[PDB]
Amino acid sequence: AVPMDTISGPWGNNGGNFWSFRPVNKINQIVISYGGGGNNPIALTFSSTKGSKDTITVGGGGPDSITGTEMVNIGTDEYLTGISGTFGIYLDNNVLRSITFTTNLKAHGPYGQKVGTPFSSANVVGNEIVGFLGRSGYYVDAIGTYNRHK
Amino acid sequence: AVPMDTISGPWGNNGGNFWSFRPVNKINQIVISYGGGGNNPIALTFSSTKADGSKDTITVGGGGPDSITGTEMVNIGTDEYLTGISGTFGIYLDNNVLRSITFTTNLKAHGPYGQKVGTPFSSANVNEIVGFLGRSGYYVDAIGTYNRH
Numbered sequence: 001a002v003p004m005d006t007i008s009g010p011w012g013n014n015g016g017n018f019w020s021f022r023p024v025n026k027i028n029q030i031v032i033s034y035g036g037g038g039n040n041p042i043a044l045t046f047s048s049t050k051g052s053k054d055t056i057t058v059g060g061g062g063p064d065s066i067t068g069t070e071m072v073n074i075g076t077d078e079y080l081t082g083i084s085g086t087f088g089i090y091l092d093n094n095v096l097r098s099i100t101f102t103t104n105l106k107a108h109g110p111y112g113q114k115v116g117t118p119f120s121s122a123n124v125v126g127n128e129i130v131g132f133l134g135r136s137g138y139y140v141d142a143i144g145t146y147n148r149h150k
Numbered sequence: 151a152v153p154m155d156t157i158s159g160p161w162g163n164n165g166g167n168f169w170s171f172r173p174v175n176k177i178n179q180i181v182i183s184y185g186g187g188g189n190n191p192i193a194l195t196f197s198s199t200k201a202d203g204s205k206d207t208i209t210v211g212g213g214g215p216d217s218i219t220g221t222e223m224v225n226i227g228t229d230e231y232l233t234g235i236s237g238t239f240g241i242y243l244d245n246n247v248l249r250s251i252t253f254t255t256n257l258k259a260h261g262p263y264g265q266k267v268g269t270p271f272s273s274a275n276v277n278e279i280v281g282f283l284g285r286s287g288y289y290v291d292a293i294g295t296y297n298r299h
Contacts, residue, residue: 002160002285002292005168010152018155020172020296023208024286054208058174135152136174142152146170 009144010134011119016141022131023054030072032111035064041112062138072108080129088116095139159294161271166291172281173198173206182263184220191264214288224260232279240268247289
């Protein structure tokens with residue numbers, strides 16, 4: 001059997017469609033997209049840009065306009081180590097309401113407001129988040145991580 | 151637990167590092183990169199172009215100094231979707247890596263990309279392939295599929 005990186009989570013709900021993104025090189029940018037004219041996350045973009053690029057956007061599958069974004073730019077000596085956030089109701093659906101991206105250097109976020117039910121990965125010694133997986137549709141229904149010893 | 155799409159394989163070996171790509175919309179293009187001035191696959195690029203014109207994309211393999219000496223492209227049509235893969239693993243430049251691959255859809259087999267050398271593998275064709283995962287480095291060390299009815 002061919003080994004694969006360890007999955008944590010996903011956290012969230014069973015709605016939407018499965019997605020997965022574990023690029024060979026480091027994820028160095030994340031874009032959080034909001035809708036509704038407020039701090040309501042509806043999509044996430046993860047990219048690994050070496051100008052050649054691997055990239056995925058999940059969520060944002062519906063008609064509602066993206067009304068704002070925030071960006072995490074991960075430095076050369078910086079790498080993802082944890083995520084946390086909340087799930088709760090947005091437009092009658094239980095979806096990601098806030099997320100934080102923690103690295104070896106700092107927590108980035110929170111992106112979205114502290115409402116709903118919390119989740120957190122285990123920030124563990126020597127571990128790196130090397131990708132993400134989850135579920136999404138119009139919004140982000142679930143998210144988890146791929147993990148590898150640094 | 152939060153469900154995930156079912157994995158078949160991966161087929162191949164434990165070299166390189168893990169990769170995964172399951173975009174929300176359909177994979178409609180594959181680019182096979184060749185090295186060595188011949189029919190030797192060194193990288194695979196999967197992409198999904200959406201109605202809004204953005205493209206999700208990953209390139210796996212091709213991590214080394216190898217010049218890309220050729221490419222082939224699979225363009226999947228509107229009513230076409232991936233259903234199976236098959237191919238072989240064997241030696242390229244003293245590495246045991248993907249040597250050939252075929253991408254089968256509901257309409258036809260595309261390929262083979264690479265020569266029939268080494269050890270064969272095949273997925274079970276039934277179901278839609280909605281993503282790929284595997285291992286890679288300089289080359290493609292392993293590949294498998296995500297599946298959904």
